[PDB]
Amino acid sequence: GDERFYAEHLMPTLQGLLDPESAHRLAVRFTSLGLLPRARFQDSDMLEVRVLGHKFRNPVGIAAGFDKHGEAVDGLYKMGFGFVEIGSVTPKPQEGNPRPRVFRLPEDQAVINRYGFNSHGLSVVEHRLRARQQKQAKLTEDGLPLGVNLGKNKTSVDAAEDYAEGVRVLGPLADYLVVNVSSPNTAGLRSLQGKAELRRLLTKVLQERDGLRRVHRPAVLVKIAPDLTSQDKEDIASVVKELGIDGLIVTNTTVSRPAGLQGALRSETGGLSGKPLRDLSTQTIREMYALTQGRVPIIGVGGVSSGQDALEKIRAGASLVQLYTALTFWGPPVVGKVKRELEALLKEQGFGGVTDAIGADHR
Numbered sequence: 001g002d003e004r005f006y007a008e009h010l011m012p013t014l015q016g017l018l019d020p021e022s023a024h025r026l027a028v029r030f031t032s033l034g035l036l037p038r039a040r041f042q043d044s045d046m047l048e049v050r051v052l053g054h055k056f057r058n059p060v061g062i063a064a065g066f067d068k069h070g071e072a073v074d075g076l077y078k079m080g081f082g083f084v085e086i087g088s089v090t091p092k093p094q095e096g097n098p099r100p101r102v103f104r105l106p107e108d109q110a111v112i113n114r115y116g117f118n119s120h121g122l123s124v125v126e127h128r129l130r131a132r133q134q135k136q137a138k139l140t141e142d143g144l145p146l147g148v149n150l151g152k153n154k155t156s157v158d159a160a161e162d163y164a165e166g167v168r169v170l171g172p173l174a175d176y177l178v179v180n181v182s183s184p185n186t187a188g189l190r191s192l193q194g195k196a197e198l199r200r201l202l203t204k205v206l207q208e209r210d211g212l213r214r215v216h217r218p219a220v221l222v223k224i225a226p227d228l229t230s231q232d233k234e235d236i237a238s239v240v241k242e243l244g245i246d247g248l249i250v251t252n253t254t255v256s257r258p259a260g261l262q263g264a265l266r267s268e269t270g271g272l273s274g275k276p277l278r279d280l281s282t283q284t285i286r287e288m289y290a291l292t293q294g295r296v297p298i299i300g301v302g303g304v305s306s307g308q309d310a311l312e313k314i315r316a317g318a319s320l321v322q323l324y325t326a327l328t329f330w331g332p333p334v335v336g337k338v339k340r341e342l343e344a345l346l347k348e349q350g351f352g353g354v355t356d357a358i359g360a361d362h363r
């Protein structure tokens, strides 16, 4: 009903009128004001997950990039997301790359983007989170946590110091922090996933984090690329277990262009998201879960647009999942649809809940 109206009528009209960045800006604006109707789906108890020192009412979150600046957090919970990740946020304000910088590939159910960390900056985001801070403390207690994804300024010399600044400013306002070292659109950023660079970076991050007061102390997760060599992945797993990193977000967008893409804009520079990323992302979750012996919580992200997609990542090793690109094609009804189908699939496969399904393929 509502799924068909968005998918077949409203979204093709929106795509026909507005460029993808303009449509994104309108989506953030409409979501922030609460103009969308409240999600009718009540989450069952079997969707509840306990991870990262928090209850999650459902395991389906909004991935970083949709709400870069912390403008639409409450509207995103109203849509039925079990958790919200804002960002990436850089220390100073910066504009990002020149337009055009977002591209639809509707034949692939994919997006390519090269935003380049457009960000209002830490100070603006700080004050915005402060204004609704006690509302968030209640939401978190009710099972609706907030993640903050940290990035690096384009012109910064010391990358670790950009991330350190992010921990000090927004760590107190977050349930979890994400060290994004996997954007394909900032020069040299993915080099930070290498063993020695990563160990130095995360030592400094965890130290800054441990210096926060206990009640204001977030979990620290590392967000990784889907384009890593076997050597890179094994090295990340090692660094993560050595330092006691709280989790992994698996994965960012891909710089690959899989055989079979049909979209006219497939050769645009940027990160590819959506359906062509999906199995590449699931396999990365599979490998990272095995290398970490199932002891490091994974948030699974990349081409989730259904209950099956979510459950494949969960079973591969993900404790929670995120989606973004699916929202650009199917609209807000995708959130309810993913959760409803997940719940049905868990019952069909003999799982009492999400928790029982996590890493089930490895057993």
Ligand SMILES: Cc1cc2nc3c(=O)[nH]c(=O)nc-3n(C[C@H](O)[C@H](O)[C@H](O)COP(=O)(O)O)c2cc1C
Residues within 6 Å of the ligand: 063, 064, 065, 066, 068, 087, 088, 089, 102, 111, 113, 115, 117, 149, 180, 223, 251, 252, 253, 272, 273, 274, 275, 277, 301, 302, 303, 304, 322, 323, 324, 325, 326
């Ligand atoms: C327009 C756009 C902007 C994004 N911005 C960010 C970002 O700022 N930080 C980040 O860590 N990931 C970012 N991502 C990556 C997503 O969070 C996610 O990892 C990826 O798109 C795979 O999920 P999906 O297939 O559901 O989109 C962005 C993705 C898109 C499509």
Ligand SMILES: CC(=O)Nc1ccc([C@H](O)C2CCCCC2)cc1
Residues within 6 Å of the ligand: 014, 020, 021, 023, 024, 026, 027, 030, 066, 102, 327, 328, 330, 331, 332
């Ligand atoms: C790149 C990007 O972010 N594109 C995007 C496009 C559409 C939407 C929303 O589904 C749509 C809901 C109803 C109001 C219009 C916006 C979200 C993201």
Ligand SMILES: O=C(O)c1cc(=O)[nH]c(=O)[nH]1
Residues within 6 Å of the ligand: 088, 113, 114, 115, 116, 117, 118, 180, 182, 183, 184, 185, 252, 253, 271, 272
């Ligand atoms: O801002 C961006 O360009 C961006 C960041 C990121 O982490 N991932 C992505 O696909 N785009």
Ligand SMILES: [Cl-]
Residues within 6 Å of the ligand: 186, 187, 188, 189
């Ligand atoms: Cl590079």
Ligand SMILES: [Cl-]
Residues within 6 Å of the ligand: 228, 229, 230, 231
């Ligand atoms: Cl390899």
